[PDB]
Design an enzyme around this catalytic site. Structure first.
Site, PDB file in Angstrom:
ATOM      1  N   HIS A   1       0.819  -1.097   0.029  1.00 55.60           N
ATOM      2  CA  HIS A   1       0.207  -0.136   0.077  1.00 55.60           C
ATOM      3  C   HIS A   1       1.033   1.161  -0.046  1.00 55.60           C
ATOM      4  O   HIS A   1       0.935   2.207   0.926  1.00 55.60           O
ATOM      5  CB  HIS A   1      -1.201  -0.124   1.134  1.00 55.60           C
ATOM      6  CG  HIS A   1      -2.118  -0.987   0.968  1.00 55.60           C
ATOM      7  ND1 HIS A   1      -2.209  -2.346   1.557  1.00 55.60           N
ATOM      8  CD2 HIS A   1      -3.235  -0.758   0.211  1.00 55.60           C
ATOM      9  CE1 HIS A   1      -3.287  -2.827   1.191  1.00 55.60           C
ATOM     10  NE2 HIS A   1      -3.901  -1.976   0.597  1.00 55.60           N
TER      11      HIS A   1
ATOM     12  N   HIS B   1       1.765   1.335  -5.657  1.00 59.28           N
ATOM     13  CA  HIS B   1       0.238   0.722  -5.846  1.00 59.28           C
ATOM     14  C   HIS B   1      -0.445   2.078  -6.321  1.00 59.28           C
ATOM     15  O   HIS B   1      -1.576   2.042  -7.363  1.00 59.28           O
ATOM     16  CB  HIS B   1      -0.278   0.533  -4.564  1.00 59.28           C
ATOM     17  CG  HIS B   1      -1.596   0.237  -4.331  1.00 59.28           C
ATOM     18  ND1 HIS B   1      -2.278  -0.734  -5.264  1.00 59.28           N
ATOM     19  CD2 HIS B   1      -2.498   0.803  -3.898  1.00 59.28           C
ATOM     20  CE1 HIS B   1      -3.506  -0.772  -4.939  1.00 59.28           C
ATOM     21  NE2 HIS B   1      -3.667   0.281  -3.967  1.00 59.28           N
TER      22      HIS B   1
ATOM     23  N   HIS C   1      -5.819   7.576  -3.404  1.00 56.17           N
ATOM     24  CA  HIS C   1      -6.923   6.377  -2.935  1.00 56.17           C
ATOM     25  C   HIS C   1      -6.364   5.839  -1.642  1.00 56.17           C
ATOM     26  O   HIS C   1      -7.178   5.632  -0.713  1.00 56.17           O
ATOM     27  CB  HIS C   1      -7.530   5.513  -3.825  1.00 56.17           C
ATOM     28  CG  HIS C   1      -6.741   4.285  -4.079  1.00 56.17           C
ATOM     29  ND1 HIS C   1      -5.471   4.113  -4.793  1.00 56.17           N
ATOM     30  CD2 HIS C   1      -6.858   3.030  -3.571  1.00 56.17           C
ATOM     31  CE1 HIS C   1      -5.089   3.078  -4.571  1.00 56.17           C
ATOM     32  NE2 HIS C   1      -5.914   2.156  -4.010  1.00 56.17           N
ATOM     33  N   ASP C   2      -5.069   5.607  -1.537  1.00 57.03           N
ATOM     34  CA  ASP C   2      -4.513   5.043  -0.107  1.00 57.03           C
ATOM     35  C   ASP C   2      -3.687   5.849   0.612  1.00 57.03           C
ATOM     36  O   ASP C   2      -2.604   5.270   1.413  1.00 57.03           O
ATOM     37  CB  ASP C   2      -3.696   3.622  -0.633  1.00 57.03           C
ATOM     38  CG  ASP C   2      -4.799   2.638  -0.609  1.00 57.03           C
ATOM     39  OD1 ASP C   2      -5.786   2.399   0.203  1.00 57.03           O
ATOM     40  OD2 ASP C   2      -4.642   1.380  -1.447  1.00 57.03           O
TER      41      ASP C   2
ATOM     42  N   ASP D   1      -8.423  -0.890  -8.203  1.00 60.15           N
ATOM     43  CA  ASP D   1      -7.546  -1.222  -7.029  1.00 60.15           C
ATOM     44  C   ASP D   1      -6.995  -2.633  -6.928  1.00 60.15           C
ATOM     45  O   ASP D   1      -6.041  -2.882  -6.404  1.00 60.15           O
ATOM     46  CB  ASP D   1      -8.410  -0.978  -5.920  1.00 60.15           C
ATOM     47  CG  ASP D   1      -7.715  -0.692  -4.606  1.00 60.15           C
ATOM     48  OD1 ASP D   1      -6.441  -0.432  -4.633  1.00 60.15           O
ATOM     49  OD2 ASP D   1      -8.457  -0.766  -3.525  1.00 60.15           O
TER      50      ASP D   1
ATOM     51  N   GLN E   1      -5.949 -17.560  -2.761  1.00 59.15           N
ATOM     52  CA  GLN E   1      -5.970 -16.935  -4.114  1.00 59.15           C
ATOM     53  C   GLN E   1      -7.403 -17.343  -4.887  1.00 59.15           C
ATOM     54  O   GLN E   1      -7.936 -16.561  -5.363  1.00 59.15           O
ATOM     55  CB  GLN E   1      -4.658 -17.077  -4.888  1.00 59.15           C
ATOM     56  CG  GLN E   1      -3.452 -16.068  -4.377  1.00 59.15           C
ATOM     57  CD  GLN E   1      -3.777 -14.576  -3.957  1.00 59.15           C
ATOM     58  OE1 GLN E   1      -3.909 -14.042  -5.290  1.00 59.15           O
ATOM     59  NE2 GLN E   1      -4.109 -14.338  -3.031  1.00 59.15           N
TER      60      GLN E   1
HETATM   61  O1  LIG Z   1      -5.497 -12.734  -2.114  1.00 61.42           O
HETATM   62  C1  LIG Z   1      -5.683 -11.592  -2.500  1.00 61.42           C
HETATM   63  N1  LIG Z   1      -5.366 -10.957  -3.575  1.00 61.42           N
HETATM   64  C2  LIG Z   1      -5.624  -9.675  -3.816  1.00 61.42           C
HETATM   65  C3  LIG Z   1      -4.774  -9.360  -4.933  1.00 61.42           C
HETATM   66  C4  LIG Z   1      -5.193  -7.751  -5.061  1.00 61.42           C
HETATM   67  C5  LIG Z   1      -5.850  -7.110  -4.315  1.00 61.42           C
HETATM   68  C6  LIG Z   1      -6.351  -7.611  -3.025  1.00 61.42           C
HETATM   69  C7  LIG Z   1      -6.256  -8.824  -2.878  1.00 61.42           C
HETATM   70  C8  LIG Z   1      -6.625  -9.648  -1.821  1.00 61.42           C
HETATM   71  N2  LIG Z   1      -7.669  -9.267  -0.856  1.00 61.42           N
HETATM   72  C9  LIG Z   1      -7.770 -10.128  -0.013  1.00 61.42           C
HETATM   73  C10 LIG Z   1      -7.063 -11.263  -0.445  1.00 61.42           C
HETATM   74  N3  LIG Z   1      -6.673 -10.914  -1.541  1.00 61.42           N
HETATM   75 MG   LIG Z   2      -7.398   1.208   0.169  1.00 65.65          MG
HETATM   76 ZN   LIG Z   3      -5.549   0.577  -2.954  1.00 65.94          ZN
END
Ligand SMILES: O=c1[nH]c2ccccc2c2nccn12
Ligand SMILES: [Mg+2]
Ligand SMILES: [Zn+2]
Length: 313
Positions: free
Chosen positions: A68, A72, A106-107, A217, A269
């Site tokens: 973050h 990003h 945004h962050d 995002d 994932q």
């Molecule tokens: O496993 C993942 N991959 C990500 C990849 C991009 C942005 C958020 C995430 C994420 N948020 C919770 C779990 N996450």
């Molecule tokens: Mg954020």
């Molecule tokens: Zn973000």
């Protein structure tokens, strides 16, 4: 006025593509961002001196956290640039201005902790903002930088355009709270499918802008496999640090955030792609068809994570 930014030929060409990676050279990112504003917005939208001073104050107020961070911010701004360029006539002068700035901001001042950890820690920001805690803070930080002397990039707008653009940016930044994504996409799904979606209805535009913000995002999941895989390490570096801080408060973190359960990452994932990413890009592609490449790339990366579990890599 006659001072263009130009990128080298590989970047000039690849920057128009959704899957563009901004590269490891931090000193080129401001120029990449100005390039995108000039082509997305016009060379007249902003006063270059003010823009450059805004950008460097925004850079300075991102922290050295694994994910973050400033990289990003610019990655998310590039994804919004790609969406706006592939959907030329759908968005107003004000929206194109507002949304690229919203993405960059945004962050702002993120520490690498979820809204949940702030609540369990009892952080002062959690007392001042009960929901979308970090997101109300990021918008607050944006307004502060815009009020620094020489930093008001919106100074040529009218009183009313100024309030409109700051309303676009506030809604855009709040919408990057993923806890709000689920209800927003579900409502957009219903409106597309029952055919009531109406881009002239401002409540509808807001929802669609919110989905674009979620899409930008999460855009790490829409890159070529080697970028997606290496960005996932930075994402999990923050999750595991937060998990460590949960254990310090006397709370077992969910397994996604526990660094003793790395083995469970590939399946985490899968759940995330199926539960969040694929539905996000599906709906976005239904509403804005030229964003289909984000859905294709997300699918390719889901397939790549399935291969990781079958031990094929
Ligand atoms: O496993 C993942 N991959 C990500 C990849 C991009 C942005 C958020 C995430 C994420 N948020 C919770 C779990 N996450
Ligand atoms: Mg954020
Ligand atoms: Zn973000």
């Amino acid at each position: 006025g006659l001072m263009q930014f130009t990128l080298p030929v590989r970047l000039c060409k690849e920057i128009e593509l959704f899957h563009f990676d901004i590269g490891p050279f931090e000193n080129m990112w401001p120029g990449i961002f100005v390039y995108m504003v000039h082509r997305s917005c016009g060379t007249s939208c902003f006063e270059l001196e003010k823009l450059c001073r805004f950008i460097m104050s925004v850079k300075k107020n991102y922290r050295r956290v694994p994910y973050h961070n400033w990289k990003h911010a610019v990655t998310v701004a590039h994804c919004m640039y790609a969406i706006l360029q592939n959907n030329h006539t759908l968005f107003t002068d004000l929206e194109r201005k507002g949304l690229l700035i919203a993405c960059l901001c945004h962050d702002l001042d993120h520490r690498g902790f979820s809204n949940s950890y702030l609540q369990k820690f009892d952080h002062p920001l959690a007392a001042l903002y009960s929901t979308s805690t970090m997101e109300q803070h990021h918008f607050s930080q944006t307004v502060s930088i815009l009020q620094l002397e020489g930093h008001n990039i919106f100074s040529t707008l009218s009183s009313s355009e100024y309030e409109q653009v700051l309303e676009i940016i506030r809604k855009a930044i709040i919408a990057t709270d993923l806890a709000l994504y689920f209800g927003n996409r579900k409502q957009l799904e219903e409106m597309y499918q029952t055919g009531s979606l109406n881009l002239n209805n401002q409540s509808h535009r807001d929802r669609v802008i919110g989905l674009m913000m979620t899409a930008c995002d999460l855009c790490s999941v829409t890159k070529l496999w080697p970028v997606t895989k290496l960005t996932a390490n930075d994402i999990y570096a923050e999750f595991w640090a937060e998990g460590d801080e949960m254990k310090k408060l006397g709370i077992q973190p969910i397994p996604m955030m526990d660094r003793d359960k790395k083995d469970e990452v590939p399946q985490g994932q899968l759940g995330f792609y199926n539960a969040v990413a694929i539905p996000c890009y599906t709906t976005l592609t239904q509403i804005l068809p030229p964003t289909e490449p984000l859905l294709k790339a997300c699918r390719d990366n889901l397939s790549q994570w399935e291969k990781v579990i079958r031990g094929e890599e």
